[PDB]
């Protein structure tokens, strides 16, 4: 009846990756008011659906972390992770760099130890 066809298939050699691209970039916002500090670290070009726990690591430059500034949120679908969080300025004292890490779950935890970071 209708014209048929039955081609055999052939593997391609350069099966290049597609989809979004891993290039950690970002801009932080350390807005400070009366005695609390809201911080909006907007990151882009991150990992499609990953967790990005970010806090304030004190001077130590692997040092201790004021864990009372943990912000946990997930990375959208193109790596558009937007972290936010309030912390009394008194706790913040002696913090030197806001380190962004990957997470193992929305319950904090540490997977990667410093994917992106900035002084203050």
């Amino acid at each position: 009846g209708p014209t048929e066809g039955t081609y055999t298939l052939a593997p391609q050699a350069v099966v290049k990756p597609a989809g979004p691209v891993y290039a950690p970039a970002g801009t932080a916002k350390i807005s400070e008011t009366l005695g609390v500090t809201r911080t909006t670290i907007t990151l882009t070009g991150m990992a499609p659906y990953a967790i990005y726990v970010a806090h304030y690591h004190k001077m130590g430059s692997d040092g201790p972390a004021i864990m009372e500034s943990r912000m946990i949120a997930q990375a959208s679908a193109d790596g558009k992770v937007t972290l936010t969080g309030i912390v009394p300025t008194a706790l913040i004292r002696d913090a030197a760099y806001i380190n962004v890490h990957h997470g193992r779950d929305f319950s904090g935890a540490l997977a990667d130890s410093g994917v992106i970071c900035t002084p203050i």
Partner: peptide
């Protein structure tokens, strides 16, 4: 010699494994 490109490919794989792990874990 010419295995500099091989080193670059190894680095790309190193980053890709972490990216896959993180996306799937998320």
């Amino acid at each position: 010699s010419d295995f500099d490109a091989l080193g670059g490919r190894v680095t790309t794989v190193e980053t890709r494994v972490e990216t896959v792990n993180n996306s799937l874990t998320g």
